[PDB]
Design a protein around this ligand. Structure first.
Ligand SMILES: [Mg+2]
Ligand SMILES: [Mg+2]
Ligand SMILES: [Mg+2]
Ligand SMILES: [Mg+2]
Ligand SMILES: [Mg+2]
Ligand SMILES: [Mg+2]
Ligand SMILES: [Mg+2]
Ligand SMILES: [Mg+2]
Ligand SMILES: [Mg+2]
Ligand SMILES: [Mg+2]
Ligand SMILES: [Mg+2]
Ligand SMILES: [Mg+2]
Ligand SMILES: [Mg+2]
Ligand SMILES: [Mg+2]
Ligand SMILES: [Mg+2]
Ligand SMILES: [Mg+2]
Ligand SMILES: [Mg+2]
Ligand SMILES: [Mg+2]
Ligand SMILES: [Mg+2]
Ligand SMILES: [Mg+2]
Lengths: 152, 101, 165, 87, 166, 309, 107, 98, 138, 89
RNA sequence: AAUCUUACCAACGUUUCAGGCUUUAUCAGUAGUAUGAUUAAUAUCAAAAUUAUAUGAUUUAGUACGGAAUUGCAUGGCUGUCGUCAGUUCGUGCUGUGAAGUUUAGGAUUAAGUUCUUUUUAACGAAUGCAACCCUAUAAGUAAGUUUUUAUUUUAAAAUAACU
RNA sequence: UGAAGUCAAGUCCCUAUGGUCUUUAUACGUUGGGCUACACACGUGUUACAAGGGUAAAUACAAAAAGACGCAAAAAAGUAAUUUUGAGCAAACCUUUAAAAAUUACCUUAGUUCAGAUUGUUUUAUGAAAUUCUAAAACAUGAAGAUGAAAUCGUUAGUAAUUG
């Protein structure tokens, strides 16, 4: 009765994220930038609600990860005609998060109906968009719950 | 009558709607025609009907909604060449930046 | 959109005094020759002064642009040249002082075509400059408009530019 | 060279209409002898028949014979008048 | 100081008048303009939930105020989660507490229900067999109708031919 | 040749992109698309907005529209109607026809309205009996059978006063071109046990011969009933010719044979059809050309190739 | 010309669909067939069948979703627009030509 | 994989063991290094830097030797870009004056 | 990164017909009946229950025409309730085909419909149809 | 004329929010084109009074120069239109 | 540039708005389509089957007709090149009758109107550009780590191999 | 990343626009054709004239980028192009990607096991459609060319060149 749950969340955020050691110290030649600050509300969720999390139903092992990826839009000609050299390039930069945390459980849910597949997955994941900010929006999301079905 | 853009957008529109609805028809006919295991006749009678249709709504070619110019298009944005040089001045394009590798 | 909405017809947090004082009158004395040009548009004097200060503060290219277009259209195509010489002095001398207060820095405005002329007559280019308009400063900020004016002689394109901190 | 054999040869809407009108016995005439869509292959039933083929702003004439079968209409007709550098 | 404000979420309807009688003189867009403060429409909320948009904004420049919206959004997340997490505890708590019975199987839309009504000579062709597979499994795009309507167009090619066509 | 051609212009119509629905709000005093699940949550919020707010102000529109929808969706709400009937004095002899239709339509179908609530709308429906549409009046007949608050007698006297002049005057245009306006009417009467000869005359001229009767369940139930009136002899006018036409449809059309019996008088099951799976009764079914259009040419095609022999 | 030469190899070119003898099936063959009913797989020879064109995905409507935006032409997507000023300039300039056209017709 | 069975030719092989002569600790140790990226010659010269940096943690006496042989310095030198109107980095179209 | 595919010469060509390997079809036997199966689960009185693990995804992008992106429903199934013999295991590794499978669990995916419910029940109809056809062996 | 290459895009991603802040994946074409359809609907809905239009013709029946000039909106001065996305909102 | 594209040539055909709104008149067993016939093709005609889905299909008048037709020596807008050369220019003050110059002339330095200098009874300051801030590759230091990254190590089960 | 502005440089034929012209035609839709013609000649660029090469067989290491009107592993067939088949993935998770070189062996300076055009005929792929007017593979055809006059161009280190 310590069945495991798996939740993997991805985000998108165009601007650079900032290191938390770098708030009191940062070079004035870089101070006028933009950053996607406050990308850590995900971590904060498991400290405010630490008192509400029961012992039957408890999160643990929450971790983040960073990546970067460029998409290519193409080199577009800059003139109306007869200038092949004139090409201004265009591209797109992104930064993805990858949250991943487990929550244990004493329960194990039973299934007896199709509608139960909707009561537990489809209503929650569609209502998971709250876990979001303006710049930090989410592409995908995952939930894994062990279950029981009485086939035959 | 209509100016060139608002006309030509409709031509390239009606060509797709035809395809959208004769989709299932033209996928089954073409399925039989390439089914080598069948006799040749039924493979041909489908080829006979497959041509007995409006080809005019099949000669599709891309177009830009804004300029009316057809040859160069950015599929990532769905708009043209003469326009992106303009919007890039205004910065209207979202999340784009100049590649400095 | 299949999604929830909230629309916010908000206003600016800025307001103006109720009492005339010196610092209004100092502007009215300088902006007098424009009053003739201003009456053609049925535009008031009080309102024109405000929108610029809203513009220097709020940094919205769209607002101060429409003020021009209502003037530059109601006028006749002889008189555009003078209106700008009064606009150059107005920005360059009077309002150049407000810049450092509002963390504001830079103005630039470039016309294109037949600002005043008829039939077969040359192009002319007019400019306005004050403060900083740099482009290789990737850490400097900007906002950019590319505009259009119609006449009986032809067409005129204008480029507003602006910069702030 | 040509297509693979299993890719059956092309005969458009039109010639399929004409082959049927042959089958009924309806003779070929001013407009029925007319041909377009040259890529359509030259069928076998229509031996002993004239067909006025189209190019540009006028036409060409031919009769069908068993040797002409299998080919395409547009391989017998010339579109571009040949080029000769003058003296 | 922050101006006054209004909020309008579907209670709009109750105040609404007929269309046979409306103010032809005064327009809403004018009322929005001449009336002080600010005005807000939004699609609605629950009792436990906060307005999405911050009702007030410190600055007026775009660049300098948008962080006030990030702070607001994060400031909004919490009551929605206690409503979410609390349910996610409760639903699971029902199901392990429910009793098990056999899985109450239910109906799927499939094309085989039409296939097994057709006679042999259609069912035995390589065509219609290969139809009912790929239109059943590898094509979710289509309705239950558009697939059944596809066989009957394929079954026509099971039939023989006249001598004209041949 | 013209551009655009008519066959093209239908493409944009069949997909539905020719409309602009916000214009409908100015045409209909009630307008609630519910084209999305978010929009539906906007409905439930109203229902909780009322239960929580005992003190509440309204207009005549927002009241009547909510009832129209709850009736249309069929949600049960014994608490909503008593809360809203209080205000009905506010809009006596004032409401539009379209709105007077709604709360009327909902009071019947709800099976929850008061005899005072129904009394308020019946005075208004009559007050606008001319401008009201025919298809609207027909849906009222669909609700009399679904309501049980009233006795069927009062529903009939109300049907003779206000509803007959609508339909009979607006028969040739609003109803006659349409089959759906007729079918729901013909079903709506027998379920109400009302039989007037001013209508069944006007109705039966057209129904049994239409192509619009595409669903066999629409064909059959007309055949199910018209065979019964003969047994009872209720209607005086002869009907024998009408019924024979429906039999020929039920026989000739190969679908009806595959789903229905005249003699056994029922539909087939799914299992029973598998028994008749391989029984191929059809005669001379095959790929063809000109057959049902011009079979003369097929005969010529036999002569020519025979002459070559 | 058509140079043909003899192929000293024999027999049908083998295939899963051809190794099968439905009258005499092995255990490994009934098992695969029992998978095909489940997931809808296909068994066919080395030669082409039409399943590759029944399994394909062909989404033409996604282009219409661009044509249905009507961002490029507001009047086609939002007919309540009425460009008042642009019509005024269009009318003034026309009428002034007609002054010129008639006055030049005399002159 | 095995040493002779991955780095086939010996000039790829002496590079990686050039430090091991400079240490004189031959056969004392057992080596296991995992590499991914680049081509064979560039994939070998990295093995100089890694052992030379690995040994000096053990034998810091060997440092001024590895300084002289430049086995501890990286090679930031990396391939250049293809400009637009150039066939590649530093290669332009033919100039035409007539 | 990915290393490149290479066709190694595993088997030599010309090896005598007598020295080759050939393996019979172990699945050739008399298949079980139904009551033989039900007699195995007498501890549970005609009732079997399976432990499984349901993955599922959602997207903010699944809308007007990409609304089909939310149709997959990935599942795993645990086997230790399945008292699988040596012959029952190999039969099960064939039905799945060239698909993932371990001693502990195996995958099951369906993307046959638009709505995930219909793709979820189909997994149950597969799990049943695979357990029976698997336990039809001894 | 010397080539003043694209200044704003050289500055945007590192020093300036774009005219809107949202982002999307697999739906870049819709939102980028659909908000442009809404920037100008609202402009042309406000800067030109259309509530007076929707009354006269769209509605059945059973000042004019004053509107074509938009005299009622002569004091109106818009600054921007902005768009956002998060939390399904 | 296979068709479309494509503007050009030849020929058949069309004669004024796509959607929305207003309006005139007729039809409603009529209307429509993965239908059928017809033409080279758009077009045009129509009841064997099928669809019937609220408030129709067709028609008159009106709601900015149209134009790759011309003048880039009437213009915008976009762009090439002189040139990645290092210059262009303003406010005030000084000098000269004045044009104008100084500043932007000396010394050195710089790839650079680059920077430094106490060259001077006169220039001080300011904008733009070059530069630099930003991105790629590097070492050193900190911060985070994935069922997806890589390696060292370890727990438990199955197969294979070994045999404790 | 690129100032001021010059070359009345270029474009009204991407879109906008002033003047001018046309409006039963300088406008519009469709079918077919044409832009792919061939005396002489120019600019650009790929492949070769060989042995630091060609070929057969066995068989290593990459980056960057893209993916559902898609990528498509594993097994199997074919001589080969490629096809059957579609596990798995909307993603650092699954997938699409190397050659030159190095090793072993033959060819032994020959207009040649170099070169590889051109042409005939089947097969392979897309499409409604390949003749005018597509690309690729095989059997077979197997021309010129034997490092190029006067003249002239690119390059400054991870550059030239070579490899994909
Ligand atoms: Mg094409
Ligand atoms: Mg395949
Ligand atoms: Mg062409
Ligand atoms: Mg053409
Ligand atoms: Mg023309
Ligand atoms: Mg010129
Ligand atoms: Mg000087
Ligand atoms: Mg690089
Ligand atoms: Mg890096
Ligand atoms: Mg010229
Ligand atoms: Mg050309
Ligand atoms: Mg070579
Ligand atoms: Mg090999
Ligand atoms: Mg692989
Ligand atoms: Mg393979
Ligand atoms: Mg699959
Ligand atoms: Mg080699
Ligand atoms: Mg030779
Ligand atoms: Mg050779
Ligand atoms: Mg030689």
């Amino acid at each position: 009765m310590n069945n495991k749950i798996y939740i993997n969340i991805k985000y998108k955020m165009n601007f650079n994220p900032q290191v938390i050691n770098s708030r009191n110290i940062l070079s004035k030649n870089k101070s006028n930038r933009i950053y996607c600050k406050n990308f850590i509300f995900t971590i904060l969720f498991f400290d405010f609600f630490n008192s509400t999390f029961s012992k039957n139903f408890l999160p643990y092992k929450y971790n983040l990860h960073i990546t970067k990826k460029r998409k290519h839009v193409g080199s577009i000609l800059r003139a109306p005609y007869k200038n092949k050299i004139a090409q201004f390039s265009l591209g797109l930069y992104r930064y993805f998060l990858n949250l991943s945390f487990f929550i244990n459980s004493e329960f194990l849910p039973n299934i007896n109906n199709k509608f139960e597949f909707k009561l537990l997955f489809i209503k929650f994941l569609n209502s998971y968009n709250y876990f979001e900010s303006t710049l930090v929006t989410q592409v995908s999301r995952v939930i894994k719950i062990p279950t029981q079905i009485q086939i035959i | 009558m209509l100016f060139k853009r608002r006309k030509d957008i409709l031509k390239c529109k009606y060509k797709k709607i035809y395809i959208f609805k004769n989709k299932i028809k033209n996928i089954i006919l073409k399925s039989i025609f390439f089914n080598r295991n069948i006799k040749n006749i039924n493979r041909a009678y489908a080829y006979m009907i497959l041509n007995n249709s409006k080809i005019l709504y099949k000669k599709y070619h891309k177009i830009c909604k804004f300029s009316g110019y057809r040859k160069n298009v950015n599929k990532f944005t769905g708009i043209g060449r003469h326009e992106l040089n303009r919007k890039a001045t205004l910065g209207q394009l979202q999340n784009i930046s100049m590649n400095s590798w | 959109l299949n999604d929830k909405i909230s629309i916010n017809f908000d206003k600016y947090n800025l307001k103006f005094m109720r009492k005339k004082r010196l610092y209004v009158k100092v502007l009215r004395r300088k902006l007098r020759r424009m009053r003739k040009m201003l009456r053609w548009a049925k535009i008031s004097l009080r309102n024109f002064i405000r929108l610029t200060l809203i513009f220097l503060c709020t940094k919205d290219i769209d607002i101060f642009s429409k003020v021009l277009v209502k003037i530059m259209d109601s006028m006749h195509y002889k008189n555009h040249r003078r209106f700008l010489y009064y606009l150059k002095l107005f920005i360059s001398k009077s309002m150049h002082y407000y810049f450092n207060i509002l963390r504001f820095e830079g103005f630039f405005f470039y016309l294109s075509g037949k600002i005043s002329g008829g039939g077969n007559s040359k192009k002319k280019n007019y400019a306005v400059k004050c403060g900083k308009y740099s482009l290789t400063n990737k850490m400097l900020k900007l906002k950019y408009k590319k505009g259009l004016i119609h006449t009986k002689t032809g067409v005129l394109g204008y480029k507003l530019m602006i910069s702030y901190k | 060279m040509g297509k693979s054999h299993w890719r059956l040869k092309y005969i458009s809407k039109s010639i399929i209409s004409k082959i049927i009108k042959e089958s009924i016995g309806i003779k070929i005439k001013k407009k029925i002898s007319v041909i377009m869509n040259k890529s359509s292959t030259i069928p076998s039933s229509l031996t002993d028949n004239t067909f006025y083929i189209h190019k540009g702003y006028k036409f060409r004439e031919l009769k069908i014979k068993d040797y002409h079968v299998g080919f395409k209409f547009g391989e017998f007709i010339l579109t571009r008048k040949p080029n000769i550098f003058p003296k | 100081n922050p101006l006054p404000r209004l909020q309008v979420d579907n209670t709009s309807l109750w105040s609404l008048d007929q269309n046979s009688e409306l103010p032809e003189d005064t327009s809403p867009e004018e009322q929005i303009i001449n009336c002080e403060g600010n005005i807000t429409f939004h699609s609605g909320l629950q009792d436990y939930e906060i307005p999405a948009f911050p009702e007030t904004l410190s600055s007026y420049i775009t660049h300098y105020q948008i962080p006030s919206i990030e702070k607001w959004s994060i400031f909004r997340q919490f009551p929605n989660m206690y409503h979410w997490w609390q349910k996610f505890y409760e639903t699971n708590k029902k199901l392990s507490e429910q009793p098990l019975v056999r899985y109450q199987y239910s109906g799927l839309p499939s094309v085989y229900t039409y296939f097994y009504t057709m006679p042999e000579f259609a069912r035995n062709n390589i065509v219609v067999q290969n139809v009912a597979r790929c239109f059943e499994f590898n094509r979710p795009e289509l309705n239950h109708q558009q697939k059944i309507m596809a066989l009957n167009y394929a079954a026509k090619f099971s039939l023989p031919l006249d001598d004209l066509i041949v | 040749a013209t551009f655009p051609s008519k066959e093209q212009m239908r493409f944009q119509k069949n997909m539905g992109y020719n409309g602009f629905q916000p214009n409908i709000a100015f045409k209909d005093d009630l307008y609630f698309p519910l084209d999305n699940p978010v929009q539906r949550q906007g409905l439930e919020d109203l229902i909780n907005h009322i239960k929580v707010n005992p003190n509440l102000a309204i207009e005549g529109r927002g009241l009547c529209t909510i009832l129209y929808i709850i009736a249309r969706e069929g949600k049960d709400e014994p608490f909503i109607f008593k809360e809203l009937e209080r205000h009905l004095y506010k809009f006596k002899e004032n409401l539009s026809p379209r709105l007077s239709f709604g709360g009327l339509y909902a009071s019947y179908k709800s099976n929850l309205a008061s005899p005072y609530q129904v009394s308020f709308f019946e005075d208004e429906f009559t007050r606008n009996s001319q401008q009201i549409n025919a298809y609207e009046a027909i849906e009222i007949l669909q609700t009399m059978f679904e309501n049980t608050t009233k006795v069927n007698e009062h529903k009939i006297q109300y049907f003779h006063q206000s509803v007959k002049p609508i339909i009979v005057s607006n028969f040739s245009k609003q109803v006659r071109p349409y089959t759906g306006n007729l079918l729901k009417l013909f079903i709506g009467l027998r379920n109400m046990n009302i039989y007037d000869e001013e209508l069944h005359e006007l109705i039966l001229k057209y129904l049994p011969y239409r192509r619009g009767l595409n669903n066999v369940k629409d064909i059959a139930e007309v055949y199910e009933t018209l065979c019964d009136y003969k047994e009872k002899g209720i209607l005086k006018q002869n009907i024998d010719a009408h019924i024979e036409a429906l039999e020929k449809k039920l026989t000739t059309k190969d679908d009806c044979r595959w789903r229905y019996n005249l003699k056994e008088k029922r539909f087939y099951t799914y299992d029973e059809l598998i028994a008749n799976r391989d029984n191929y009764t059809i005669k001379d079914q095959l790929n063809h050309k000109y057959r049902f259009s011009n079979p003369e040419l097929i005969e010529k095609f036999n002569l020519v190739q025979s002459d070559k022999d | 010309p058509y140079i043909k030469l003899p192929n000293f190899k024999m027999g049908i070119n083998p295939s899963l669909r051809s190794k099968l003898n439905p009258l005499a099936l092995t255990g490994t063959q009934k098992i695969m067939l029992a998978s095909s009913r489940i997931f809808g797989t296909n068994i066919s020879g080395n030669l082409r069948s039409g399943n590759s064109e029944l399994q394909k995905k062909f989404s033409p409507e996604k282009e219409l979703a661009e044509f249905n935006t009507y961002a490029h032409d507001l009047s086609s997507g939002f007919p309540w627009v009425q460009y008042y000023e642009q019509k005024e300039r269009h009318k003034m300039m026309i009428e002034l030509r007609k002054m010129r056209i008639l006055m030049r017709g005399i002159k | 994989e095995i040493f002779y069975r991955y780095f086939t030719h010996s000039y790829n092989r002496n590079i990686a063991l050039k430090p091991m002569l400079l240490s004189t600790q031959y056969c004392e140790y057992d080596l296991h290094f995992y590499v991914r990226g680049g081509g064979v010659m560039g994939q070998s010269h990295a093995c100089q830097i890694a052992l030379a940096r690995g040994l000096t943690q053990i034998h810091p006496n060997l440092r001024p030797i590895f300084m002289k042989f430049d086995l501890l310095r990286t090679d930031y030198r990396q391939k250049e870009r293809k400009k637009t109107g150039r066939y590649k980095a530093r290669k332009a179209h033919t100039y035409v004056r007539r | 990164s990915r290393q490149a595919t290479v066709k190694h010469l595993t088997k030599y060509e010309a090896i005598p017909h007598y020295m080759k390997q050939t393996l019979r079809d172990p699945h050739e036997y008399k298949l079980r009946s139904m009551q033989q199966i039900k007699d195995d689960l007498k501890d549970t009185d005609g009732k079997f229950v399976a432990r499984i693990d349901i993955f599922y995804k959602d997207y903010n992008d699944a809308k007007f025409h990409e609304s089909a992106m939310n149709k997959k429903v990935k599942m795993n199934v645990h086997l230790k309730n399945w008292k699988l013999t040596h012959s029952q295991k190999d039969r099960l590794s064939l039905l799945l085909g060239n698909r993932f499978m371990c001693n502990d669990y195996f995958t099951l995916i369906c993307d046959q419909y638009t709505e995930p419910e219909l793709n979820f029940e189909k997994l149950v109809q597969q799990v049943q149809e695979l357990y029976l056809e698997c336990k039809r062996a001894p | 004329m010397g080539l003043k290459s694209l200044p704003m895009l050289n500055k945007s991603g590192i020093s300036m929010y774009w005219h809107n802040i949202w982002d999307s994946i697999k739906l870049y074409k819709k939102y980028s084109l659909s908000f442009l359809f809404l920037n100008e609907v609202i402009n042309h809905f406000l800067n030109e009074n259309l509530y007076y239009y929707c009354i006269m013709k769209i509605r059945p029946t059973d000042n004019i120069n004053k509107i074509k000039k938009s005299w009622n909106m002569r004091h109106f001065y818009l600054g921007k239109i902005l768009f956002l996305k998060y939390q399904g909102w």
